[PDB]
Design a protein around this nucleic acid. Sequence first.
DNA 1: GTGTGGGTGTG
Length: 187
Amino acid sequence: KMARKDPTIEFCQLGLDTFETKYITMFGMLVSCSFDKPAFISFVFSDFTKNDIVQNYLYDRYLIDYENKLELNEGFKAIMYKNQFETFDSKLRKIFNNGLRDLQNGRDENLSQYGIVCKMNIKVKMYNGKLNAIVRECEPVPHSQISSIASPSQCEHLRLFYQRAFKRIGESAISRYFEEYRRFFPI
DNA sequence: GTGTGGGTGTG
C-alpha cells in the first residue's frame, strides 16, 4: 500500500532478507568518504553492534592509525545523490560553517578525526545478494541536537557509542587532535 | 520499500 513508518536498528538489530528490502535508521560516526565518483560521495560510517548481513568489503575505515584495521561488521557504506549530499552537507555547514569539502585538508576525503556522529534513514536491499544501503536523510547528531533528534532509547545508545570510541578509537589518537575531536566537550 | 555498489587499503 502507501503508508509506512521509519524503524531503527544497528547491524545486530538488522532484519533484512534476500527478497526483502526496507528502510532503517543507523547512527554512527563518519570515518571515510569518496566524492570522486560521479554518482555520489561514498561514505563509511561506524558504531557499535555487529553487522550480520553479507554486505560487501565495506573497506576497513582505516582508523586514525594506519597500522591495523577492523572488521567489516563494525562499519558500513552510506551514499546519497550529490543533491542529497548537498542537503546533508548543508546540515553540517551550520555546525561547521563549511561543507565537508571545507573539512578535509583538501587532499583525500576520508575523515575520522572529527567524528561527526549523525543519524540517517537508509534504504536497504539485496544488490545481487549484497546489502545495498542508500541514505534517505542525514541529520547531524553532535550534542546540542541529539536531545532534539533522539531521546527514547536511541539517546542512551548514542551516549554508549561515545564511551566505546573513547577507548576503542584509541586514546593515543585523540591526543593527535584532542581539540578537533572534543568538538565542544571537556575531553 | 527508487537509482548513486566503487572499494575491498593504508593516507
